[PDB]
Write a protein that holds these residues in place. Structure first.
Motif, PDB file in Angstrom:
ATOM      1  N   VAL A 199      -0.843   9.432   4.535  1.00  0.00           N
ATOM      2  CA  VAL A 199       0.566   9.617   4.165  1.00  0.00           C
ATOM      3  C   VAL A 199       1.506   9.628   5.355  1.00  0.00           C
ATOM      4  CG1 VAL A 199       2.163  11.469   3.337  1.00  0.00           C
ATOM      5  CG2 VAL A 199       0.200  10.746   1.952  1.00  0.00           C
ATOM      6  N   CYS A 200       1.147  10.401   6.367  1.00  0.00           N
ATOM      7  CA  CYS A 200       2.056  10.654   7.482  1.00  0.00           C
ATOM      8  C   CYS A 200       2.268   9.402   8.380  1.00  0.00           C
ATOM      9  CB  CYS A 200       1.551  11.874   8.271  1.00  0.00           C
ATOM     10  SG  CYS A 200       1.058  13.302   7.210  1.00  0.00           S
ATOM     11  N   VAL A 222      -1.503  13.508  13.143  1.00  0.00           N
ATOM     12  CA  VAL A 222      -0.933  12.164  13.251  1.00  0.00           C
ATOM     13  C   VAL A 222       0.245  12.071  12.287  1.00  0.00           C
ATOM     14  CG1 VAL A 222      -3.125  11.126  13.960  1.00  0.00           C
ATOM     15  CG2 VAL A 222      -2.528  11.210  11.523  1.00  0.00           C
ATOM     16  N   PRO A 223       1.245  11.241  12.592  1.00  0.00           N
ATOM     17  CA  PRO A 223       1.287  10.262  13.675  1.00  0.00           C
ATOM     18  C   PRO A 223       1.887  10.756  14.964  1.00  0.00           C
ATOM     19  CG  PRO A 223       3.171   9.918  12.255  1.00  0.00           C
ATOM     20  CD  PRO A 223       2.363  11.044  11.641  1.00  0.00           C
ATOM     21  N   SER A 273       6.588  12.829  11.971  1.00  0.00           N
ATOM     22  CA  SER A 273       6.913  11.587  11.270  1.00  0.00           C
ATOM     23  C   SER A 273       8.396  11.442  10.986  1.00  0.00           C
ATOM     24  CB  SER A 273       6.134  11.468   9.950  1.00  0.00           C
ATOM     25  OG  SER A 273       6.467  12.513   9.052  1.00  0.00           O
TER      26      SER A 273
HETATM   27  S1  LIG Z   1      -0.927  12.915   6.767  1.00  0.00           S
HETATM   28  C1  LIG Z   1      -1.990  13.314   8.188  1.00  0.00           C
HETATM   29  C2  LIG Z   1      -1.880  14.705   8.794  1.00  0.00           C
HETATM   30  N1  LIG Z   1      -0.645  14.823   9.546  1.00  0.00           N
HETATM   31  C3  LIG Z   1       0.250  15.777   9.317  1.00  0.00           C
HETATM   32  O1  LIG Z   1       0.077  16.706   8.544  1.00  0.00           O
HETATM   33  C4  LIG Z   1       1.523  15.644  10.122  1.00  0.00           C
HETATM   34  C5  LIG Z   1       2.652  16.537   9.595  1.00  0.00           C
HETATM   35  C6  LIG Z   1       3.880  16.497  10.521  1.00  0.00           C
HETATM   36  N2  LIG Z   1       4.830  17.507  10.022  1.00  0.00           N
HETATM   37  C7  LIG Z   1       4.542  15.157  10.477  1.00  0.00           C
HETATM   38  O2  LIG Z   1       4.195  14.267  11.325  1.00  0.00           O
HETATM   39  O3  LIG Z   1       5.373  14.957   9.549  1.00  0.00           O
HETATM   40  C8  LIG Z   1      -3.055  14.929   9.683  1.00  0.00           C
HETATM   41  O4  LIG Z   1      -3.025  14.614  10.862  1.00  0.00           O
HETATM   42  N3  LIG Z   1      -4.101  15.496   9.077  1.00  0.00           N
HETATM   43  C9  LIG Z   1      -5.288  15.868   9.834  1.00  0.00           C
HETATM   44  C10 LIG Z   1      -5.274  17.291  10.349  1.00  0.00           C
HETATM   45  O5  LIG Z   1      -6.254  17.685  11.026  1.00  0.00           O
HETATM   46  O6  LIG Z   1      -4.299  18.043  10.100  1.00  0.00           O
END
Ligand SMILES: *SC[C@H](NC(=O)CC[C@H](N)C(=O)O)C(=O)NCC(=O)O
Ligand SMILES: *SC[C@H](NC(=O)CC[C@H](N)C(=O)O)C(=O)NCC(=O)O
Lengths: 212, 212
Positions: free
Chosen positions: B11-12, B53-54, B66
């Protein structure tokens, strides 16, 4: 004149008030009684349809979501008072990054600690102590990243105070006072110096002394 | 050339990719294996210190969160492709307001539903069905407000597509497909038409067909 809706002692209206004070924007505060549920009444839902504060009314312009509001007044009065946005797009981006860190990584833990430790007992309910402990553990790790950043930069988005720092003021003050979790800041040398700096700014001192 | 870190199916990173595609910004995607915990390794923590990520690398510029990233590229390439920010400060403010609605009111419920229903079973864990039900109940009420808004405006921030709509694309697609909760959109006439519109945009179709 700008109308700001919400209690002066609540975190979310405080964020907005802090920006308006910093920018020298005159405003009228309209108290909304959250404990009695005024924010869920039809009249207020016409202003903020999710039944939350703050919302601002500025002539025929209406806006809600605290972090949208502080972005708007920081831009509308960009040349007045402090540079809260940054100048280059890359500077602006770092302000945005640390506003986004505030709004999830930090606030999801901090506001929920304040909810459990301060808000619930004030309306006669018991907080979940075990849940608070899980939040604390996670928040230590989040604030270790803040400490690393502040070892390299005087403020979060660069060498000057911006919206990014400003947005932390209300929830952090509840965290280290009413919630009794001041050690989270005091344990971390750069973070503690940052906190004692930004929370001593005249606009913030003004706001908190009025609130009691 | 811009480097975007993260899985194309997450998603992110998708939120960022959607903005770059809309703005015609060339980029290289660098897969990060979240299931195996690559994001928590020292090497990646040097890029994103919260182990998420990202993150983007663009020459000597680095940026994460993001929604900070999509704001940055929407401004940096403001005159290229679609007007994703709005023009007047008041237009920009409404984009910010609906980005903030996305980022808490909507995403706190939606991403957690996707986490429980899709992510956990995929890594061999059971989701909490009762917790998912509480999220659904709350999300109906949030989406009733979206429906009211979309009865009065073609898109969330005004009569044109902006970052506010764009930011909803990745989590909403998981909600109405893998999570099996398409009725939340289909039950609401204006919301459903908005969804079928924005999710049919060429940039989004491109991104999702590549992802499989
Ligand atoms: S969707 C992937 C996850 N990323 C986030 O939760 C980023 C949230 C930030 N607020 C943003 O960039 O908007 C991710 O990396 N999941 C794996 C983990 O170990 O958390
Ligand atoms: S701090 C007071 C509460 N407001 C919010 O939670 C607003 C959050 C928005 N994301 C924002 O403006 O930043 C509040 O109104 N509490 C009472 C309630 O009934 O929720």
């Amino acid at each position: 004149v700008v109308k700001v809706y919400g209690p002066a002692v609540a975190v979310c209206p405080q964020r907005v008030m802090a920006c308006l004070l910093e920018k020298g924007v005159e405003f009228d505060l309209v108290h909304v009684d959250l404990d009695s549920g005024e924010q869920k009444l039809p009249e207020f839902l016409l202003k903020q349809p999710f039944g939350q504060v703050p919302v601002v009314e500025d002539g025929d312009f209406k806006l809600f979501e605290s972090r949208a509001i502080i972005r708007y007044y920081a831009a509308k009065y960009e040349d007045r008072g402090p540079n809260l946005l940054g100048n280059t797009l890359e500077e602006k981006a770092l302000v945005d990054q640390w506003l986004e860190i505030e709004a999830h990584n930090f606030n999801d833990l901090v506001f929920n600690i304040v909810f459990q430790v301060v808000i619930l007992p004030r309306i006669g309910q018991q907080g979940d102590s075990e849940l608070v402990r899980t939040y604390e553990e996670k928040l230590e790790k989040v604030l270790d990243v803040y400490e690393k950043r502040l070892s390299k930069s005087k403020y979060l988005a660069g060498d000057s105070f911006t919206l990014a720092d400003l947005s932390h003021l209300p929830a952090t003050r509840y965290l280290v006072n009413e919630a009794g979790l001041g050690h989270l800041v005091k344990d971390r040398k750069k973070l503690n110096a940052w906190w004692e700096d930004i929370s001593s700014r005249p606009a913030w001192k003004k706001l908190m002394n009025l609130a009691g």
